């Protein structure tokens, strides 16, 4: 049905293979236009998410663009301590660091990446340079598709992003059918990581605190029932 993720609930600590797949997808597809400045590269070793091997992290970092410096202007080797690059303009898009919170979030990305079908039977010509999406709601609409008072008759609208993937864009090393849907789910989970890395710690803290406070509250209820006994016994 709704294709719920793993983390959608009181449990679900970010199944990591899914995140490694999303990383294969993000660095080879989405990175061409998008960036994640709010994301340090070293986080690809921190627990909770992709617990990759540090050495591979340093390699992948040195293999990225050149972030010059802060003290002496000079194109450095881009050490992991720096942040992911930033694609800013000239046919590029926003930053995906926290896009999983600026919208139930990841379901938006899934049902957005999912859905770029051809132009409907109201404006088949479409638009030059703009492509159609069935779920983006903040895009333009031709006058042919609007109602009598400016509202659109289409489910979604026209987004400036092209279709990101075809039937079998990339291979998975673990062994898995790399259709469009699985890639969309995986990349959605990866972005949710990039936004909420400390999710599992959140849930564990919540459990511990609920327990301890229920205990404290029960003990206080007993103490209250006791103290207030000689005044609530005859009635």
């Amino acid at each position: 049905p709704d294709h719920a993720f793993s983390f959608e609930g009181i449990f679900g600590k970010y199944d990591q293979a899914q995140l490694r797949r999303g990383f294969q997808v993000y660095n080879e597809v989405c990175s061409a236009c998008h960036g994640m400045k709010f994301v340090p590269i070293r986080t690809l070793a921190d627990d909770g998410g992709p617990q990759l091997d540090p050495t591979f992290v340093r390699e992948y970092a040195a293999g990225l663009d050149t972030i010059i410096d802060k003290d002496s202007g000079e194109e450095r080797d881009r050490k992991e301590t720096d942040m992911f690059p930033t694609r800013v303009g000239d046919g590029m898009g926003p930053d995906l660091s926290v896009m999983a919170k600026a919208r139930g979030g990841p379901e938006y990305i899934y049902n957005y990446v999912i859905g770029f079908e051809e132009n409907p039977e109201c404006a088949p010509e479409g638009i030059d340079g703009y492509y159609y999406n069935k779920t983006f709601q903040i895009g333009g609409v031709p006058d042919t598709c609007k109602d009598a008072a400016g509202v659109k008759i289409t489910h979604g609208s026209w987004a400036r992003m092209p279709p990101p993937l075809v039937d079998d864009q990339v291979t998975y090393e673990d062994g898995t059918p790399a259709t469009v849907d699985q890639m969309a789910q995986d990349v959605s989970a990866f972005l949710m990581w990039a936004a909420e890395p400390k999710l599992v710690a959140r849930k564990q803290m919540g459990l511990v605190a609920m327990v301890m406070l229920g205990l404290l509250s029960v003990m206080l209820y007993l103490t209250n029932k006791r103290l207030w006994a000689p005044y609530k016994g005859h009635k």
């Binding site: 049905p1 709704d2 294709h3 719920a4 609930g9």
Partner: protein, 254 residues
Amino acid sequence: TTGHSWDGIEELNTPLPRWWLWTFYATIVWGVAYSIAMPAATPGILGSSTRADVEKDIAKFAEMNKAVEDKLVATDLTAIAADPELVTYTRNAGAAVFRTWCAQCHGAGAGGNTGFPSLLDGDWLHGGSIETIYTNIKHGIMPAHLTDELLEPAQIDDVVQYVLKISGQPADEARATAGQQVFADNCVSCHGEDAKGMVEMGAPNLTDGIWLYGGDANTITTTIQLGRGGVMPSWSWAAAQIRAVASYVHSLGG
């Protein structure tokens, strides 16, 4: 008690029973929970739950028993009858399938009755081979001589008597001569001479032993007069199962 009496009856002002209260409230709470959980949610079903559970039931069933059917499908019908693994499971279940779907026309025994063939026996109208039986099952299934001017009231009687002779020997001399002549002319084309019958047509052999079919002179007169017209409905729509059933029916005779 309260102040007013209604003919004899008076009523105590008493409290609602605590348990009664609790149960009432609990039911209400359950109802709200149910509504939130149902259509208005529950996990496990993506989108919203519905009768959609049907798909899940079928799907798990398919996963569980798909292999058994799939293994059988590759095997030829003849092989699926022989082998007690598939082949024996094919007779009991094919036999299982048989009872649910086929038994109502062809008998629990598969022996048949008047108007329906006995599947157990050796005799086959359409042909006994595996392919034939399968075809009968998968795609499903006699000219009215009374009218054809020549046949008439008398011609039919004669042909009936003659056929009973092909099948065995009654004694009626007029009903024999005439009938032989007519059979050779017309009947023989589909049933052959000496009534071997033709499987292609589904024309049964006239030279048979005592079967469930109306052997009597009168019954033969009726089938000759009015003709046959029996159907074996196709299981291709309703029914893999057809294959197992073919294997079962085949296994039945031998």
